[PDB]
Amino acid sequence: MFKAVLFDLDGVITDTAEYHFRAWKALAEEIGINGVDRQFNEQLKGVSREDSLQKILDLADKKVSAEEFKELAKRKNDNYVKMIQDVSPADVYPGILQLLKDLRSNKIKIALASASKNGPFLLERMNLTGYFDAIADPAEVAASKAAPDIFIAAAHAVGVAPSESIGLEDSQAGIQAIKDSGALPIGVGRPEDLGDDIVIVPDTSHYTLEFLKEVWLQ
Ligand SMILES: O=P(O)(O)OC[C@H]1O[C@@H](O)[C@H](O)[C@@H](O)[C@@H]1O
Ligand SMILES: [Mg+2]
Ligand code: NA
């Protein structure tokens, strides 16, 4: 049986991928870059703050100063942080709280493998911190998603090998990171976005312990 579940946060535990998108789109348009639509944003999900800004700047081959780059990232974060202040336990996606309780009851470790430095704050907002055995610090890894490092770190933080873990993800970059870690990915979203080569569920209510067990078996 699998021994750990490695959770992405944004777009898996709650609808904060929507808020990252809105904040990045607003920032892009302030600097005159209009290509950040929902389709392009699939390339941004799971990606670090700095890599997200760089991918946006790459759209118009746009060149800002180092000072401007830092200020733009800060501006986006300040906006995002304001948008999430009213997140509450009511915003936890369907099925997720039950899954956490069921994993815990079955002595399966629970780790966060989010690229977001706002992850710990969001778990507190949602009253979820006590369910997590570990949070992998996205600033500590040498390589961010789509590199596997954060998933490897999350597994190791709970004393489990990635090969004994399931990873839950809503993003292309994160699914790739799970694949390259050795853990088993189960995506949530559209195969059109996430691929036709791994198990994908249409919504988080499908993330039941019972379903995870069967995926593991097969
Ligand atoms: O800017 P933060 O909060 O550190 O988040 C970093 C990244 O965190 C990931 O969880 C999100 O999918 C990305 O959209 C985001 O860019
Ligand atoms: Mg995500
Ligand atoms: Na406008």
Side-chain angles (χ1 to χ4, degrees), residues 11-43:
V12 171
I13 294 177
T14 190
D15 199 23
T16 40
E18 181 67 18
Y19 289 181
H20 281 297
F21 164 58
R22 292 178 188 176
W24 279 122
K25 184 184 185 82
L27 189 90
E29 291 188 353
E30 284 169 353
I31 65 174
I33 298 178
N34 297 329
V36 184
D37 60 12
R38 291 184 181 282
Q39 180 175 337
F40 180 73
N41 184 254
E42 292 298 312
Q43 298 179 48

Short mmCIF file of all heavy atoms in Angstrom, two decimals, residues 11-43:
data_model
loop_
_atom_site.label_atom_id
_atom_site.label_comp_id
_atom_site.label_asym_id
_atom_site.label_seq_id
_atom_site.Cartn_x
_atom_site.Cartn_y
_atom_site.Cartn_z
N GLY A 11 -5.32 24.83 -6.58
CA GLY A 11 -6.05 24.04 -7.55
C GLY A 11 -6.31 22.60 -7.17
O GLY A 11 -6.98 21.88 -7.92
N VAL A 12 -5.83 22.18 -5.99
CA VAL A 12 -6.06 20.83 -5.48
C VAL A 12 -6.80 20.88 -4.15
O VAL A 12 -7.84 20.26 -3.98
CB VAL A 12 -4.73 20.05 -5.37
CG1 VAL A 12 -4.93 18.72 -4.64
CG2 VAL A 12 -4.14 19.81 -6.75
N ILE A 13 -6.26 21.64 -3.19
CA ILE A 13 -6.90 21.79 -1.88
C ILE A 13 -7.99 22.86 -1.91
O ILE A 13 -8.98 22.76 -1.19
CB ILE A 13 -5.83 22.04 -0.80
CG1 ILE A 13 -4.94 20.78 -0.66
CG2 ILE A 13 -6.44 22.43 0.53
CD1 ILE A 13 -3.80 20.93 0.32
N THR A 14 -7.78 23.91 -2.71
CA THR A 14 -8.72 25.01 -2.82
C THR A 14 -8.50 25.71 -4.16
O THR A 14 -7.51 25.45 -4.86
CB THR A 14 -8.60 25.97 -1.62
OG1 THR A 14 -9.67 26.90 -1.63
CG2 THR A 14 -7.30 26.74 -1.64
N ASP A 15 -9.42 26.63 -4.48
CA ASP A 15 -9.47 27.32 -5.78
C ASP A 15 -8.52 28.51 -5.91
O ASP A 15 -8.85 29.49 -6.55
CB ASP A 15 -10.95 27.77 -5.99
CG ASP A 15 -11.33 28.09 -7.41
OD1 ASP A 15 -10.72 27.62 -8.35
OD2 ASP A 15 -12.34 28.79 -7.59
N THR A 16 -7.31 28.40 -5.35
CA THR A 16 -6.37 29.51 -5.40
C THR A 16 -5.58 29.55 -6.70
O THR A 16 -4.97 30.59 -7.00
CB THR A 16 -5.42 29.49 -4.19
OG1 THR A 16 -5.06 28.14 -3.95
CG2 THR A 16 -6.12 30.08 -2.97
N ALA A 17 -5.60 28.49 -7.53
CA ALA A 17 -5.05 28.64 -8.88
C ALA A 17 -5.79 29.73 -9.65
O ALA A 17 -5.17 30.48 -10.42
CB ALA A 17 -5.09 27.32 -9.64
N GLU A 18 -7.10 29.87 -9.43
CA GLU A 18 -7.87 30.95 -10.03
C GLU A 18 -7.31 32.31 -9.63
O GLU A 18 -7.21 33.23 -10.46
CB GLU A 18 -9.33 30.84 -9.59
CG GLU A 18 -10.24 31.90 -10.17
CD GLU A 18 -10.45 31.81 -11.68
OE1 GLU A 18 -10.17 30.75 -12.26
OE2 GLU A 18 -10.96 32.81 -12.27
N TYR A 19 -6.98 32.48 -8.35
CA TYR A 19 -6.46 33.76 -7.86
C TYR A 19 -5.05 34.05 -8.34
O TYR A 19 -4.74 35.21 -8.69
CB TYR A 19 -6.56 33.86 -6.34
CG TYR A 19 -7.93 34.00 -5.78
CD1 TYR A 19 -8.09 34.12 -4.43
CD2 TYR A 19 -9.08 34.09 -6.58
CE1 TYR A 19 -9.33 34.28 -3.86
CE2 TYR A 19 -10.34 34.26 -6.02
CZ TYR A 19 -10.44 34.34 -4.65
OH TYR A 19 -11.67 34.50 -4.05
N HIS A 20 -4.18 33.04 -8.42
CA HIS A 20 -2.87 33.24 -9.04
C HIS A 20 -3.02 33.71 -10.49
O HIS A 20 -2.32 34.62 -10.92
CB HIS A 20 -2.02 31.98 -9.00
CG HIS A 20 -1.37 31.70 -7.69
ND1 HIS A 20 -0.43 32.54 -7.13
CD2 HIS A 20 -1.49 30.64 -6.86
CE1 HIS A 20 -0.02 32.00 -6.00
NE2 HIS A 20 -0.62 30.83 -5.82
N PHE A 21 -3.92 33.07 -11.23
CA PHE A 21 -4.18 33.46 -12.61
C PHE A 21 -4.63 34.91 -12.70
O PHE A 21 -4.10 35.70 -13.48
CB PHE A 21 -5.26 32.53 -13.21
CG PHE A 21 -5.89 33.06 -14.48
CD1 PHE A 21 -5.11 33.34 -15.60
CD2 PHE A 21 -7.26 33.27 -14.54
CE1 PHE A 21 -5.70 33.84 -16.75
CE2 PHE A 21 -7.84 33.75 -15.70
CZ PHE A 21 -7.07 34.04 -16.80
N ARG A 22 -5.63 35.29 -11.91
CA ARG A 22 -6.14 36.65 -11.98
C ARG A 22 -5.04 37.67 -11.64
O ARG A 22 -4.95 38.72 -12.30
CB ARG A 22 -7.32 36.83 -11.03
CG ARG A 22 -8.57 36.04 -11.48
CD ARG A 22 -9.72 36.19 -10.51
NE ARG A 22 -10.83 35.30 -10.84
CZ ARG A 22 -11.96 35.15 -10.13
NH1 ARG A 22 -12.24 36.09 -9.23
NH2 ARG A 22 -12.87 34.32 -10.55
N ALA A 23 -4.24 37.37 -10.63
CA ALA A 23 -3.16 38.28 -10.22
C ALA A 23 -2.06 38.38 -11.29
O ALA A 23 -1.59 39.48 -11.60
CB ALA A 23 -2.59 37.83 -8.88
N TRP A 24 -1.67 37.25 -11.87
CA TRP A 24 -0.65 37.30 -12.94
C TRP A 24 -1.18 38.00 -14.19
O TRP A 24 -0.42 38.73 -14.84
CB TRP A 24 -0.13 35.90 -13.30
CG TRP A 24 0.90 35.37 -12.39
CD1 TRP A 24 0.84 34.22 -11.67
CD2 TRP A 24 2.15 35.98 -12.06
NE1 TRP A 24 1.98 34.06 -10.92
CE2 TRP A 24 2.79 35.14 -11.12
CE3 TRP A 24 2.79 37.17 -12.44
CZ2 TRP A 24 4.03 35.45 -10.58
CZ3 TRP A 24 4.02 37.47 -11.89
CH2 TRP A 24 4.63 36.61 -10.98
N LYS A 25 -2.44 37.77 -14.54
CA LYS A 25 -3.01 38.45 -15.70
C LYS A 25 -3.02 39.97 -15.49
O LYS A 25 -2.67 40.73 -16.39
CB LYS A 25 -4.41 37.91 -15.96
CG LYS A 25 -5.07 38.48 -17.20
CD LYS A 25 -6.50 38.00 -17.37
CE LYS A 25 -7.12 38.45 -18.67
NZ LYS A 25 -6.73 37.60 -19.81
N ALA A 26 -3.43 40.41 -14.30
CA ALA A 26 -3.44 41.83 -13.99
C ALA A 26 -2.04 42.42 -14.10
O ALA A 26 -1.86 43.51 -14.65
CB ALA A 26 -4.00 42.07 -12.61
N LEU A 27 -1.05 41.73 -13.56
CA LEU A 27 0.31 42.21 -13.64
C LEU A 27 0.78 42.31 -15.10
O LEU A 27 1.34 43.34 -15.52
CB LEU A 27 1.25 41.35 -12.81
CG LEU A 27 2.66 41.95 -12.69
CD1 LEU A 27 2.82 42.88 -11.49
CD2 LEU A 27 3.66 40.84 -12.61
N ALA A 28 0.54 41.26 -15.88
CA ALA A 28 0.97 41.24 -17.27
C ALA A 28 0.37 42.42 -18.02
O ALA A 28 1.07 43.15 -18.75
CB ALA A 28 0.57 39.93 -17.93
N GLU A 29 -0.91 42.65 -17.83
CA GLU A 29 -1.55 43.74 -18.55
C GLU A 29 -1.04 45.10 -18.11
O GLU A 29 -0.95 46.01 -18.96
CB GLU A 29 -3.05 43.68 -18.44
CG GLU A 29 -3.63 42.51 -19.21
CD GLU A 29 -5.14 42.51 -19.31
OE1 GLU A 29 -5.78 43.37 -18.65
OE2 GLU A 29 -5.69 41.65 -20.04
N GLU A 30 -0.68 45.28 -16.84
CA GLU A 30 -0.07 46.54 -16.37
C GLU A 30 1.22 46.85 -17.12
O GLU A 30 1.53 48.03 -17.36
CB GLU A 30 0.20 46.49 -14.86
CG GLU A 30 -1.04 46.67 -14.01
CD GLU A 30 -0.87 46.37 -12.53
OE1 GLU A 30 0.18 45.87 -12.11
OE2 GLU A 30 -1.83 46.63 -11.77
N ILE A 31 1.96 45.82 -17.50
CA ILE A 31 3.19 46.04 -18.25
C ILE A 31 3.01 45.92 -19.77
O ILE A 31 3.99 46.01 -20.52
CB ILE A 31 4.39 45.26 -17.68
CG1 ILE A 31 4.17 43.76 -17.81
CG2 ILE A 31 4.64 45.65 -16.22
CD1 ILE A 31 5.37 42.94 -17.40
N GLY A 32 1.77 45.81 -20.22
CA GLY A 32 1.47 45.82 -21.65
C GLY A 32 1.54 44.48 -22.36
O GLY A 32 1.61 44.45 -23.60
N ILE A 33 1.50 43.39 -21.60
CA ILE A 33 1.53 42.03 -22.14
C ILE A 33 0.13 41.43 -21.97
O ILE A 33 -0.36 41.30 -20.84
CB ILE A 33 2.57 41.19 -21.37
CG1 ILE A 33 3.97 41.79 -21.57
CG2 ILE A 33 2.52 39.73 -21.79
CD1 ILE A 33 5.08 41.09 -20.81
N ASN A 34 -0.51 41.08 -23.08
CA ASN A 34 -1.92 40.70 -23.09
C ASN A 34 -2.19 39.22 -23.30
O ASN A 34 -3.34 38.81 -23.29
CB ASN A 34 -2.65 41.53 -24.14
CG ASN A 34 -2.62 42.99 -23.80
OD1 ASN A 34 -2.59 43.37 -22.63
ND2 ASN A 34 -2.63 43.83 -24.82
N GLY A 35 -1.13 38.43 -23.43
CA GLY A 35 -1.28 37.01 -23.76
C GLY A 35 -1.59 36.06 -22.62
O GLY A 35 -1.67 34.85 -22.87
N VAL A 36 -1.72 36.55 -21.39
CA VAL A 36 -2.02 35.69 -20.26
C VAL A 36 -3.54 35.46 -20.19
O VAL A 36 -4.26 36.11 -19.44
CB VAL A 36 -1.46 36.19 -18.90
CG1 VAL A 36 -1.77 35.18 -17.81
CG2 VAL A 36 0.03 36.47 -18.98
N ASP A 37 -3.99 34.50 -20.99
CA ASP A 37 -5.36 34.00 -20.94
C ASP A 37 -5.37 32.64 -20.25
O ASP A 37 -4.33 32.13 -19.83
CB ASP A 37 -6.03 33.99 -22.33
CG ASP A 37 -5.34 33.12 -23.35
OD1 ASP A 37 -4.46 32.32 -23.04
OD2 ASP A 37 -5.74 33.26 -24.53
N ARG A 38 -6.56 32.05 -20.12
CA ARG A 38 -6.63 30.77 -19.39
C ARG A 38 -5.79 29.69 -20.05
O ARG A 38 -5.16 28.88 -19.37
CB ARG A 38 -8.07 30.31 -19.19
CG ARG A 38 -8.84 31.17 -18.22
CD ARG A 38 -10.23 30.63 -17.96
NE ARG A 38 -10.99 31.47 -17.05
CZ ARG A 38 -10.85 31.51 -15.72
NH1 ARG A 38 -9.99 30.72 -15.09
NH2 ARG A 38 -11.59 32.34 -15.01
N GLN A 39 -5.78 29.66 -21.38
CA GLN A 39 -4.98 28.65 -22.07
C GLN A 39 -3.49 28.82 -21.77
O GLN A 39 -2.80 27.86 -21.41
CB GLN A 39 -5.24 28.70 -23.57
CG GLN A 39 -4.46 27.68 -24.37
CD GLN A 39 -4.82 27.66 -25.85
OE1 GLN A 39 -5.90 28.08 -26.24
NE2 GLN A 39 -3.92 27.14 -26.66
N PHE A 40 -2.97 30.05 -21.90
CA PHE A 40 -1.56 30.28 -21.59
C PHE A 40 -1.27 29.96 -20.12
O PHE A 40 -0.21 29.43 -19.78
CB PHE A 40 -1.14 31.72 -21.89
CG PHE A 40 0.31 31.97 -21.57
CD1 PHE A 40 1.31 31.45 -22.37
CD2 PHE A 40 0.68 32.65 -20.41
CE1 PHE A 40 2.64 31.65 -22.04
CE2 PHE A 40 2.01 32.85 -20.08
CZ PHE A 40 2.99 32.35 -20.90
N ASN A 41 -2.21 30.28 -19.25
CA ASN A 41 -2.03 30.05 -17.83
C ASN A 41 -1.79 28.58 -17.47
O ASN A 41 -1.20 28.29 -16.44
CB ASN A 41 -3.19 30.65 -17.05
CG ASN A 41 -3.01 30.54 -15.56
OD1 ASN A 41 -3.68 29.69 -14.88
ND2 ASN A 41 -2.13 31.33 -15.03
N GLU A 42 -2.19 27.63 -18.33
CA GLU A 42 -1.81 26.24 -18.07
C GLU A 42 -0.30 26.05 -18.00
O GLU A 42 0.16 25.14 -17.31
CB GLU A 42 -2.44 25.31 -19.10
CG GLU A 42 -3.96 25.23 -18.98
CD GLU A 42 -4.42 24.68 -17.63
OE1 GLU A 42 -3.88 23.62 -17.21
OE2 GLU A 42 -5.32 25.30 -17.01
N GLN A 43 0.47 26.90 -18.69
CA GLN A 43 1.93 26.88 -18.61
C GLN A 43 2.48 27.51 -17.35
O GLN A 43 3.66 27.34 -17.06
CB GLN A 43 2.53 27.61 -19.83
CG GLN A 43 2.18 26.97 -21.16
CD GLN A 43 2.77 27.71 -22.33
OE1 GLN A 43 3.96 28.03 -22.35
NE2 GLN A 43 1.95 27.97 -23.33
#
